[PDB]
Design a protein around this ligand. Structure first.
Ligand SMILES: C[C@H](O)CCC[C@@H](O)CCC/C=C/c1cc(O)cc(O)c1C(=O)O
Ligand SMILES: C[C@H](O)CCC[C@@H](O)CCC/C=C/c1cc(O)cc(O)c1C(=O)O
Ligand SMILES: [K+]
Ligand SMILES: [K+]
Lengths: 268, 269
């Protein structure tokens, strides 16, 4: 029942995407690694509740690598939001619920603020607003050292579940291996300063639901809790750390379905 | 030089207390384990910046164990605040800056709200507001089972620094071993519901500075960040987890000194 295909947008990107289901649109935007196979289990569980679920590899990453260099260098939330609107346009998705973690979180808040008529509601998880020099500094290393450093960070520091992370399988980890240097060179130096959470009053009353990982060290996304609370935005936790859709797919799917259902009720 | 002595209060407690320095009073209230040797390095560093620093073991715990049963059973923030005021009265400490973590955090917020004339400013760290059934359930086990379980929890789950925690040494850990069953039977069922942070508007504008451990899992004191932000109370992080005065004593001491200095400036302003 899964459609697995490609679509070309006039910004030069040939996207790999997947779709499943019929009903209101739910779009799952990847984290910075850009790898939509991380949503595989959850896409079927969400679609089975009466939704059309769409996800895709991000430009320059995995199977969406046929893209111009501007789409995967000096990347900002605003660039990514423009790229996601281009694929929604191409797929004729007029009104979508959106999820994103990491740069995906920055993307979905930029989508909700920038394109309000297009976005039913946004779920953001672990939105990066701080420059971390130790990750910025990986951008100047050789590709093999970047892949080794970041593969270890994901598995041992922020996966929220090392066994589920490894169980993504050899093919996915081979794609991630190639994505690590693209991510290092294009994301950590430019994504955090582009965070669309400088104007707290712009977030107030918006259909935004914000999460942090329950096991994430407090320091990592402390600022997300403070910002959400200042804006009166719903803020809570999902199990695990940076990849709840990998570590806890059934909890993740239930959250996405229940949050979408809450906004469908409110909308009527 | 450090005073190390005992003093009795008319509520029946014989306190073990330590004091060092001259200047404005800073009082370091222990966490639930009630063991003031955890502050030993910090007391000297803080006192050296021009403060009189006082600390003590808590009633029923460590060297303050000669105390009536009411002082270490059915413990609440408000009971602990009344006990701390008793020792501050006994030591003629009229106006104090106070620090506390855990049940100590609940105690210092209860002190600031209940005795505003006595408290210059309060620093609270990791204030418990939720009942945890797995900790409340230790109370029915045998003393040795409680000590073994909670010694392991403190080292592995909340110390913030296994080397520093173990380096407290045999004397301290032998006192903690005896305290674990007292704490388990007296604290976790009654402290969280007593949290004095249910009235958010009562906190607004108060001289309160709130911290959580940087490495603490986000779930543990998520509610503290939310509450502090709702109240407009200063909220930030210290290195480590539940025992920054053990894991990072020099950072802890600098925080206490700088926060006290900030409020001395504001008090004159
Ligand atoms: C206090 C912490 O525990 C210290 C270690 C934090 C480390 O493990 C986080 C690993 C995932 C990185 C996200 C991130 C980082 C960055 O510098 C820029 C970004 O754009 C991102 C992003 O896009 O998500
Ligand atoms: C989501 C988290 O990771 C789950 C694990 C949290 C666990 O490891 C922390 C242990 C520290 C507890 C202090 C405390 C707690 C309490 O419920 C009542 C009290 O009275 C106190 C007190 O007296 O100090
Ligand atoms: K699950
Ligand atoms: K230190």
């Amino acid at each position: 029942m899964r459609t697995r295909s490609t679509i070309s947008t006039p910004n030069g990107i040939t996207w790999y995407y997947e779709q499943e289901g019929t009903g209101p649109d739910i779009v799952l935007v990847p984290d910075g690694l850009g790898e939509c196979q991380m949503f595989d289990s959850s896409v079927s569980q969400i679609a089975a509740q009466g939704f059309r679920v769409t996800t895709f590899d991000m430009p320059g990453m995995s199977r969406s690598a046929k893209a111009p260099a501007e789409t995967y260098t000096e990347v900002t939330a605003q660039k990514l939001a423009s790229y996601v609107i281009s694929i929604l346009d191409a797929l004729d998705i007029k009104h979508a619920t959106v999820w994103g973690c990491s740069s995906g979180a920055s993307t979905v808040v930029a989508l909700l603020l920038g394109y309000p008529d297009r976005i039913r509601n946004a779920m953001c998880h672990e939105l990066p607003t701080k420059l971390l020099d130790h990750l910025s500094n990986t951008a100047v290393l050789e590709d093999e050292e970047i892949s080794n450093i970041l593969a270890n960070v994901m598995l041992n520091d922020v996966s929220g579940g090392s066994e589920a992370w490894q169980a993504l399988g050899v093919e996915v980890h081979a794609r991630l291996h190639k994505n690590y240097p693209v991510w290092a060179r294009g994301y950590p130096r430019t994504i955090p300063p582009s965070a669309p959470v400088q104007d707290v009053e712009a977030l107030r009353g918006k259909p935004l639901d914000w999460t942090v990982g329950a096991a994430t060290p407090t320091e990592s996304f402390f600022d997300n809790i403070v910002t959400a609370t200042k804006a009166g935005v719903n803020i809570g936790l999902l199990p695990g750390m940076h990849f709840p859709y990998v570590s806890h797919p059934d909890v993740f799917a239930k959250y996405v379905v229940e949050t979408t259902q809450k906004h469908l009720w409110n909308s009527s």
